[model samples]
Target: KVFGRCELAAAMKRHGLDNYRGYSLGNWVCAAKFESNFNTQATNRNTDGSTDYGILQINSRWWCNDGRTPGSRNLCNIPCSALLSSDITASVNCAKKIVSDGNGMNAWVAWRNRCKGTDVQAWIRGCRL
Candidate 1:
């Protein structure tokens, strides 16, 4: 898990994820909170038969391979396990490609549900980023 919002934001900024593709770092932070509570090892199997992985909770249906699960597009061409690490490099890189694919932050259901139309600044309040 991240030490706090500041650390998460700083790590995102260092990876060029802050303000990326027209989405604010706050959006990322807020979504991350709902998606995985900042825990890199988070995973969930959806009713749709797809699994979400990592802090971003990327879906196996289109982004990564879960190995045993079938029907994955593997668009990011990385293993789902790669995203579960505390090192978020693989997750951030794949998420960038996902946003560039035209979904923006809408790629995350958590973002659409919890972050859209909100005062996202609260997500970064008191952070030195």
Candidate 2:
């Protein structure tokens, strides 16, 4: 029930992204927690009582398309309720694809930094490994 506790960890593990656990996962969790407690089923009503839905809080009105219906496609273009379905790995993989761009968490990190962070390698360390 914590950040990255769902398919996030599994995706990271499957893709050799375990390094995401301590730092990257923590960051994602922090952001998600701040917004919706990582609830993929979350929704918010505007003043007119219209709605916004799903985790990552993506609005269906703008993102939905191409045989995609409203309330479909969670944060990563997967189904909304899929988050609660049996194989959370699908949602996790979708999330990883979002953060990683099918590349890796590094891409996710880069995107996050650019969009929401300081846009610098603030946490990077230099050393011979």
Candidate 3:
């Protein structure tokens, strides 16, 4: 389990993602903190019958396949289980794909609900970039 906002910020930087579309890195940090608390193994079943996976909580609906859900485009071309690991490469790659789709952070409900329009600078405070 990763702890501390600086650590997470470093991870994000290592992934080479400072922002996507117009969403700032602080927004991503805040979303990850709220969505999964930096726990890669985090999973949540949405009311829409889709499950969110990993720190960024990529949903199975369009990103990955959980096998239980049918008709998954598996757009990320990865198994949902792959997102539930400490190595965030797959999850980050998948997130980039989502961002590239032009949805940006709007794809994340947690971002919309918690991080959107909020002062998210604290999520990366004290982090040495």
Candidate 4:
């Protein structure tokens, strides 16, 4: 499923992403846009044989287990497939766990390159509530 910019913003807010872990709601919104363009069905395979799943594009190597990645941590304790849906619940929860780590949003190179240290408000200018 694909979401509009503001639509994803509202969803993230409801999922408790507003200023979550020192990152602004814009960061979450921006990250999703960059990672998957708000497409929940988005999935990208990696050169290392791992895959990125969902809007947040969580990785199978560390977060969810796709039963494919070797030495998978499954830190999110969920199937990688759970994140590939219109519902952002699993993706949001998994992203929360990711930010709680030492890396924070730094885990996402897209986030770091585009959203980090930038004028975050620009990402959600018209995304009220």
Candidate 5:
């Protein structure tokens, strides 16, 4: 998986995440592990040669705007700061739509199943949203 057991465990502790080891991060880590093997560098196709980067598969076009020089809405992009912010609960809630069942956390369970065989705790901590 992208986030190893140690990583998840550490992330959970570092971020003060609760419950989802039985609650939230539990599901989020599962999705991230499955989506990119927890690899922050995971990326795929982009029509204009732009790239997607990071564990959450953040696309430069949709998220970052380095291409626009200084006049871009890139300020609103999701990245390390956003993930590490105290407001991550809001972000994770937003992520539910992108990663999981879109109604509940079933998609996270599916992802965890796919990315199994790792130290899920570490992966959970390493995972942000």
Candidate 6:
């Protein structure tokens, strides 16, 4: 399922992205928008042959177990396929884990390059309720 902008922001807020670990809710919303356009079923194979899955594009090389990434950490301890569902619970959890390290948000290339440093409030301007 693909989410509308406001709908996606609300979902992120519902899952407690607001002020999460010094990363504002907007950052989360912004990154997801850049990564997958709020599409729950999104997936991509990268240059290293690792796959990034779901709305937040949780990578198989570290966060998920896809059986294709060698010596993967499975840091989120969930199957990559689980991330493709509309539920988004697994995706959200894995994303939270990804940014758990101080400023560990470095993994999101699009965020760092394109969406980063842009005004973030509009992503949730009408969806804060």
The predictions' CA RMSDs to the true structure, in order, are 1.1, 7.9, 1.4, 0.8, 7.5, 1.2
Regarding lDDT, does 4 or 5 come out ahead? 4
Per-residue lDDT for 23-126 in model 6, tens only?
78788888988899999999999889899999989989889999998867798999999999988789888888888855667778888887677887767787
> What tens-digit string does per-residue lDDT give for candidate 3 at 1-129?
664688877887789777756666788789889988988899999777889999889999899999876666699999999999878889888988887887667788778889888988878877798
lDDT tens digits by residue: candidate 1, 1-129: 553778888898889988899888988889889999999999999887889999999999999998756766899999999999888899999999998987778878779989999998798889997
Index of the highest-lDDT prediction: 4
Q: For candidate 1, what is the TM-score?
A: 0.94
The 0-to-1 C-alpha lDDT of every candidate, in the order given, reads: 0.88, 0.42, 0.84, 0.92, 0.46, 0.85
* TM-scores of all candidate predictions against the true structure: 0.94, 0.41, 0.91, 0.96, 0.44, 0.93
Q: What lDDT would candidate 5 get against the real structure?
A: 0.46
Comparison by lDDT, 1 against 3, better one: 1
Please give, for residues 1-129, the per-residue lDDT of candidate 5 as tens digits: 245645654554455544433444554565555655665446554566655444444444444554633333343354423433423342343343344324344433445465445454554454444
TM-score: model 5 vs. ground truth: 0.44
RMSD of 5: 7.5
Candidate 4 overall Cα lDDT vs. reference? Answer: 0.92
Error of model 5, residue 124, in angstroms: 5.9
What is the per-residue lDDT of model 2 for residues 12-120, given as tens digits with 9 covering 90 to 100? 3454433443335445433444445556656565454334444444334333222334344434564444444333354455554454544443433323543345422
Q: In every candidate, how many clashes are there?
A: 0, 1, 0, 0, 23, 0
Q: Write model 4 residue lDDT over 3-47, tens digit each, in one string.
A: 999988999999999998989998998899899999999999999
lDDT of 6 at 84: 94
| TM-score pick, better of 1 and 5 | 1
Q: Rank the candidates by TM-score, best first.
A: 4, 1, 6, 3, 5, 2
